[PDB]
Amino acid sequence: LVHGGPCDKTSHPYQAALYTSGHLLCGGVLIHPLWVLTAAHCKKPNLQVFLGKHNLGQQESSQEQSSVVRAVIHPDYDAASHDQDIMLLRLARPAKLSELIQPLPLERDCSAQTTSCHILGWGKTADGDFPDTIQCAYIHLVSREECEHAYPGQITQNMLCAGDEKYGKDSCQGDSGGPLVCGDHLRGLVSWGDYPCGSKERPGVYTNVCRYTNWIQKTIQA
Numbered sequence: 694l695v696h697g698g699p700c701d702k703t704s705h706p707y708q709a710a711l712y713t714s715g716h717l718l719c720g721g722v723l724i725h726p727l728w729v730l731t732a733a734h735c736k737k738p739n740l741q742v743f744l745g746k747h748n749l750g751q752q753e754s755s756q757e758q759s760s761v762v763r764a765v766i767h768p769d770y771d772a773a774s775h776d777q778d779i780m781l782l783r784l785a786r787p788a789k790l791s792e793l794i795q796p797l798p799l800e801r802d803c804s805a806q807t808t809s810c811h812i813l814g815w816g817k818t819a820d821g822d823f824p825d826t827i828q829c830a831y832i833h834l835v836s837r838e839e840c841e842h843a844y845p846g847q848i849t850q851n852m853l854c855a856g857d858e859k860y861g862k863d864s865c866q867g868d869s870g871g872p873l874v875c876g877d878h879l880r881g882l883v884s885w886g887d888y889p890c891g892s893k894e895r896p897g898v899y900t901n902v903c904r905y906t907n908w909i910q911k912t913i914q915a
């Protein structure tokens with residue numbers, strides 16, 4: 694996450710850190726004590742989910758760890774175009790909820806109003822390093838027509854765009870699968886965007902969570 698700052702340690706209880714090979718790979722969102730929602734491009738072997746993390750460089754009293762039982766990628770995910778970039782992870786152990794570990798409710802309304810949003814993650818910052826402390830930024834939803842011109846032929850109905858025209862606040866590598874929060878609801882998941890990270894010119898592209906209500910329900914009930 695570029696051009697942001699450290700989060701208030703009590704503001705992100707839904708945030709998950711996804712590790713493979715001992716390093717941070719992706720973010721994720723706790724949506725149910727047994728499930729974390731992330732991007733399908735985060736599928737890697739032996740994912741380890743960390744809940745209640747703020748600083749990755751220190752052992753915290755709030756942190757919980759879980760292996761993944763199964764990873765459920767959306768049947769229509771297209772890695773070439775990033776279309777339907779969503780995956781459900783079933784936790785081996787139900788998340789022990791606290792004031793620092795809580796699920797985030799999903800936005801089910803695709804017409805939903807709220808344009809003022811926020812992003813968070815442990816992805817690459819402006820200096821190019823991977824921060825130990827989670828980063829936050831307030832960003833705004835970018836209209837469908839405007840995102841379509843930034844990335845011609847690349848934006849589907851399963852994607853939402855968001856960014857910051859003023860300073861370029863944007864998600865980055867490592868933020869993938871993290872949340873786009875609008876009106877205290879999960880509106881999107883970090884999917885892709887511009888290279889290098891920064892949304893001054895072209896906005897960040899997010900998986901449109903409202904489109905997956907049925908599939909998320911059906912997966913959780915399976």
Ligand SMILES: N=C(N)c1ccc(NCc2ncc(-c3ccccc3)[nH]2)cc1OCc1cccnc1
Nearest residue numbers: 734772864865866869884885886887888890897898
């Ligand atoms: N600028 C952004 N808002 C942004 C946010 C997240 C990501 N995630 C990386 C990522 N998305 C999709 C894939 C992927 C999919 C299929 C197969 C292999 C890989 N990888 C990338 C972003 O911008 C591009 C970018 C690329 C590399 C380094 N920095 C930024």
